[PDB]
Amino acid sequence: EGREDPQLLVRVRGGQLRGIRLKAPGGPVSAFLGIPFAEPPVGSRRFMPPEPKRPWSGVLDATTFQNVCYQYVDTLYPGFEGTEMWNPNRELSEDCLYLNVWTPYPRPASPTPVLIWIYGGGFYSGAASLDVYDGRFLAQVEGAVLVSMNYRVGTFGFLALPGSREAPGNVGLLDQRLALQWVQENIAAFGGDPMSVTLFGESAGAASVGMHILSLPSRSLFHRAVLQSGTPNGPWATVSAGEARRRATLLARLVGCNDTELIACLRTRPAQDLVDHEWHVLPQESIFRFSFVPVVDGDFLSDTPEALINTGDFQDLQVLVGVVKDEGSYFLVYGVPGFSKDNESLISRAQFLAGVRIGVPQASDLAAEAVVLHYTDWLHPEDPTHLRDAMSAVVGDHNVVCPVAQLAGRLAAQGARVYAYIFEHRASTLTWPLWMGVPHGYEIEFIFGLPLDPSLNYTTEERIFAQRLMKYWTNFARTGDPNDPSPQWPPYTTAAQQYVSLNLKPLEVRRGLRAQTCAFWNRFLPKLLSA
Ligand SMILES: *[C@@H]1O[C@H](CO)[C@@H](O)[C@H](O)[C@H]1NC(C)=O
Ligand SMILES: *[C@@H]1O[C@H](CO)[C@@H](O)[C@H](O)[C@H]1NC(C)=O
């Protein structure tokens, strides 16, 4: 100490930290990156619930992002920014339980509302250090205290032998919870208000948020919640204990392995070997399905998310939820024949029927025909453009839009204050093809205010747009109302089903979140599948 920037030295429960002055377009922010919050979940701790980080001595340097949790690395389009932006940007390691904090510079004088980000990536990938999660803009422009944590994904985070001691399941979610607890105890040191904590996340991050809402021990740890393009209910975010057990033992076999001994063998395997077989345990050929996700353990999750939302009391809850215009397009190039980023992906009626079986992998023959019947345009049954887009809609509706619809409806019917949106602006910088429209994941860069960074080549209108969204999100975190005390954003209600469009145009209000089609997925399909 002595000749150091006095405004970057901070103490937390575990010890002393030195952070970094970062440049944002409109001025400096304080960043504290790679703060450990758990004991490394390595060796005999693999598959185990996280234990809190033991205090250290000296000044921990907190000026760079820490390791990314060990994970699958995408290879579909090597070199292509559209896929690479989501790939790990620091060394892969099982020792990865660290978190990040951005705050105004100098730090806030009064207690500031805290946003906590939880990244998505199907519960098998992701990292808080990605460029699209850069907190400097929300910190600098809105004066937010922003926190984001790494959590274990894949087998390391979610492989479960339900009931066992050595692999209880959901430890990735416990990593998240431990970091929420860390914020409660320590965020005041940075000027953050522990009594105003809003969770937000996208895709599996969104599902994670939803699960914290549904799990009592997390409830005391936050006050409001944003769920972007993801839900804890729906077909991909959880598996039953039986299915978890089945996938865990299959994967053990594949790598050469009484729960205790099985798990102990798994713990002897190099991280990379587990990753190399993680995609080989899915029950059917599929897209938008992930091998190791939260399990219904009857503990963290006392029952299925469907049951928990259908019956829970949510009077104290304020939630913001929404979707992008083309939730499904992204996923089609990852396993539906006929789809590519490199061409128009016009497909035949045959490819559409085949796409449906892969897109709705759990459907019986009858259920799948119902899907094809509903989505077919009977004026143009064979039109390759309609079919391409209908395949997208099937995947988007089944996995995101309708699970979101069910969530908003149940939450509202049961006391929560809900705001709902659809994001419809396509980044002028998007590198995916036009046919994909506004794909899943591509609102995030706007919510975090990347267009304010002049070197990123967004349009002036995109810059203004981003600022608006930053205002909505931070207003909602601040007050539980996106609106600024300009057209208004009404709550979503069972009776009016109102939501807003988010684009370059001023807020426009709409009614019914795919009401008709979602009745099919949410009300009819369940009944049909039995049997
Ligand atoms: C686009 O690419 C995919 C995969 O290479 C291919 O199957 C399909 O035939 C192509 N579409 C057209 C109409 O050229
Ligand atoms: C932005 O535009 C300039 C000028 O064309 C270009 O040289 C630069 O690489 C661009 N940056 C990005 C990331 O698009």
From Swiss-Prot:
It is found in: Synapse; Secreted; Cell membrane. Glycans are attached at residues 258, 343, 457. Coiled coil: none annotated. Its EC number is 3.1.1.7. Predominates in most expressing tissues except erythrocytes where a glycophospholipid-attached form of ACHE predominates. GO terms for cellular component: basement membrane; cell surface; extracellular space; Golgi apparatus; neuromuscular junction; perinuclear region of cytoplasm; plasma membrane; side of membrane. It is a peripheral membrane protein. It catalyses: acetylcholine + H2O = choline + acetate + H(+). The active site is at residues 203, 327, 440. The keyword Repeat does not apply. Disulfide bonds join 69-96, 257-265, 402-518. The keyword Lipoprotein applies. Keywords: Cell membrane, Disulfide bond, Glycoprotein, GPI-anchor, Hydrolase, Lipoprotein, Membrane, Neurotransmitter degradation, Secreted, Serine esterase, Signal, Synapse. CDD domains: Esterase_lipase (cd00312). GO terms for molecular function: acetylcholine binding; acetylcholinesterase activity; collagen binding; identical protein binding; laminin binding; protein homodimerization activity; serine hydrolase activity. Its main location: other. GO terms for biological process: acetylcholine catabolic process; acetylcholine receptor signaling pathway; cell adhesion; osteoblast development; positive regulation of cold-induced thermogenesis; receptor internalization; regulation of receptor recycling; retina development in camera-type eye. Isoform H generates GPI-anchored dimers; disulfide linked. Isoform T generates multiple structures, ranging from monomers and dimers to collagen-tailed and hydrophobic-tailed forms, in which catalytic tetramers are associated with anchoring proteins that attach them to the basal lamina or to cell membranes. In the collagen-tailed forms, isoform T subunits are associated with a specific collagen, COLQ, which triggers the formation of isoform T tetramers, from monomers and dimers. Interacts with PRIMA1. Terminates signal transduction at the neuromuscular junction by rapid hydrolysis of the acetylcholine released into the synaptic cleft. Belongs to the type-B carboxylesterase/lipase family. Synapses usually contain asymmetric molecules of cholinesterase, with a collagen-like part disulfide-bonded to the catalytic part. A different, globular type of cholinesterase occurs on the outer surfaces of cell membranes, including those of erythrocytes. This is the catalytic subunit of an asymmetric or soluble form of ACHE. This is Acetylcholinesterase. It comes from Mus musculus.
